[PDB]
Design a protein around this ligand. Structure first.
Ligand SMILES: [Mg+2]
Ligand SMILES: [Mg+2]
Ligand SMILES: [Mg+2]
Ligand SMILES: [Mg+2]
Lengths: 182, 182
């Protein structure tokens, strides 16, 4: 029961990202052209916490912003892969780490006005580095370790610019306090 | 001091949204094509709270997701407009409301991998409806009022799907408790 009816759906780009331009008839009966990244598509985000109450994060170059941002490891969920598997895979690729339990946190749409993507956050416990990172061509990042108290101080001070990382931290907080890690 | 050098920047679309396809030489000396929504561009988000401890929110159709999402009023910052002015304007357009103090909250990038956009959240106090909403062609939404206790219960239960709305609520929470509204 969509409120808008499709007139024509044009593919504007397929790679590196699929983008479409859709002509639709809206709730007013008038026509509108809507450009967006179609679904279904998703990505997983994972806050990796060690047994020492530190977090394994990444400082990554995000070209559209021209900045290196402090983020939790994350990546697109591949075709036929579960969000938890993509989380573990990106954790191993970007930080060279493995973890035990992965607690799922509330999923969210980062920008529903433009993209159908759903982001799936996870809190990973007993994270540990076991191998060197394996980055894709295109990824420019370094991994680092920070005490959770410092990560949450940055959050409270409003210094975590990546929304997904900030939101993952907020959802993770009650669990970290419950587990005695924060 | 960008780590990537521009080879060529092509405009893929200019309206309804500007999108570019940039060929760059990366940190590895190899070429890569990067598609993104360029900056500088921004939007303001505003959590409007009444003197009765309720919030004025919107239930809005977000076509890429095919869902109506519960969100705080928000919109693109126009050319030469401050983020606070865009916040007040979208509050008046979408909810027909005005407010007194607007407390700025930490800004964030909703999806730095794809867009340069910066979102500027605000907590608006003494919000009150004073006029009928004035929606743009393309906007399909209804305004509603909910007790803050219910809004935060939904947040804690993981039912707030729009990331920006969720993050605005998390940043607003300490202020609401400080002011005795939550
Ligand atoms: Mg990644
Ligand atoms: Mg990756
Ligand atoms: Mg809006
Ligand atoms: Mg609007």
């Amino acid at each position: 029961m969509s409120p808008w009816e499709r007139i024509l759906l044009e593919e504007i780009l397929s790679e590196p990202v699929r983008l479409v331009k859709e002509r639709v008839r809206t709730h007013t009966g008038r026509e509108l052209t809507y450009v967006y990244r179609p679904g279904p598509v998703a990505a997983s985000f994972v806050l990796p916490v060690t047994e020492r109450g530190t977090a394994l994060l990444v400082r990554q170059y995000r070209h559209p912003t021209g900045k290196f941002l402090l983020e939790v490891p994350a990546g697109k969920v591949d075709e036929g892969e579960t969000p938890e598997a993509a989380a573990r895979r990106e954790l191993r690729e970007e930080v060279g780490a493995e973890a035990e339990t992965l607690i799922p946190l509330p999923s969210f749409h980062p920008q529903p006005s433009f993209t159908a993507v759903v982001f799936h956050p996870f809190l990973a416990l007993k994270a540990r580095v076991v191998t060197p990172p394996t980055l894709e061509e295109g990824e420019l990042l370094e991994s680092l370790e920070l005490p959770l108290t410092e990560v949450y101080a940055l959050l409270a001070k409003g210094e975590i610019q990546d929304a997904s990382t900030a939101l993952t931290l907020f959802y993770a907080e009650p669990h970290l306090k419950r587990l005695g890690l924060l």
